[PDB]
Design brief:
signaling protein; homodimer; BAR/IMD domain-containing adapter protein 2 (chain A); 92% helix; 222 residues; cellular signaling protein; mainly alpha
């Protein structure tokens, strides 16, 4: 390591600062934004029922009519398809709250605070092994300049501190990057987890309509 | 129990009555729930945007990361799939509005008033033919009791045959008039339930296109995103 092992230290620092300065505040925004989105979804849930019952009611009247009885069956079936799709939506929504939103809230609420302490702790021991090396060198200097094997004790003590430091930094940086990568990953995963539940929503709708649509269409063209 | 003409006449009156007293009111309630449902979805549309921006921003922060840049793309793709799907919703929405709701709205608005005039016109006309028949048949009975068999003058017998002729004609016109009203009644009734189903179909057709566009975008990318997670 040259005088560039300074960069590695400085980098560990920025990684921690950036998670606090940008990552968490933006994630919070993401959460709030997601919640707003969640709230609108729940809205569709309540309104869906009013519509459902109105379909059924048209269905009943048709089933009670003088000569449009067969159409009552079409209406009921349409209401039925709506009920099932509406249920797959609620499944997705529940998965939106329980696996993405609630999770992220919990993992972000105190995260900056701990990263702060984690960073401070890192710098502290980093500053410690540095001050210990300097003072150790400020001695190998007081000796070499005074001698104008006690020297062998330092040159070999310096190199040990130089090693124990170079591998404390490199070590911090590794952890740091894990810290950064892990937070994005977690986000992506849960997103996938809900996107997967989303798929089961569209697939059921596509499926359900595929079966019934041609029949409803024929009942009309009848 | 006044023949098939009286029974059919009654069904005509009940058919118009059911369209005005139940079909139309329940249809207005249907439109009303349709609109509440429409607003709800519209609500989703707006929130969708903010969510979109958020995703993109996390994507940008990831592309500027040191060792998470890869994930930046997975987020951007998710943002994309979401934006597209969101547009497909806007569409189902537009058809839900332009083909069903607005359509049922003007159809229903002044309907019972026209159905009401239609009913009255039918009732009035079928009552004239009915009264005309009864009077006619009444003057006949009145004429017969003046009969003196073998001695009835030609003036007499000719008049009787004139009435028999007229009764036969009025009698038949009335029957068809009622018989014709009934067919039209069933058509008025039939047509509305049918129009509802049609529009419901059009919206369903739109709904399939949205749901299907969703399954392709996700079934296509999900497995790949599933990999980026695997790291």
């Amino acid at each position: 390591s040259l005088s560039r092992s300074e960069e590695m230290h400085r980098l560990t620092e920025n990684v921690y600062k950036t998670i606090m300065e940008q990552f968490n505040p933006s994630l919070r925004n993401f959460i709030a934004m997601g919640k707003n989105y969640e709230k609108a979804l729940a809205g569709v849930t309540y309104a869906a029922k009013g519509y459902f019952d109105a379909l059924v009611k048209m269905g009943e009247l048709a089933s009670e009519s003088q000569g449009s009885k067969e159409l009552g069956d079409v209406l009921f079936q349409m209401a039925e398809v709506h009920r099932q799709i509406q249920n797959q939506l609620e499944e997705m929504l529940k998965s939106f709250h329980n696996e993405l939103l609630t999770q992220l809230e919990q993992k972000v609420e105190l995260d900056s605070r701990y990263l702060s302490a984690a960073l401070k702790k890192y710098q502290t021991e980093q500053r410690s092994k540095g001050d210990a090396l300097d003072k150790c060198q400020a001695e190998l200097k007081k000796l070499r300049k005074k001698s104008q094997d006690k020297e062998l004790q330092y040159i070999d003590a310096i190199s040990n501190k130089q090693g124990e430091l170079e591998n404390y930094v490199s070590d911090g940086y590794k952890t740091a990057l894990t810290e950064e990568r892990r937070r994005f990953c977690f986000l992506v995963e849960k997103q996938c987890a809900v996107a997967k539940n989303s798929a089961a929503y569209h697939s059921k709708g596509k499926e359900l309509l595929a079966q019934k649509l041609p029949l409803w269409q024929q009942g009309v063209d009848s």
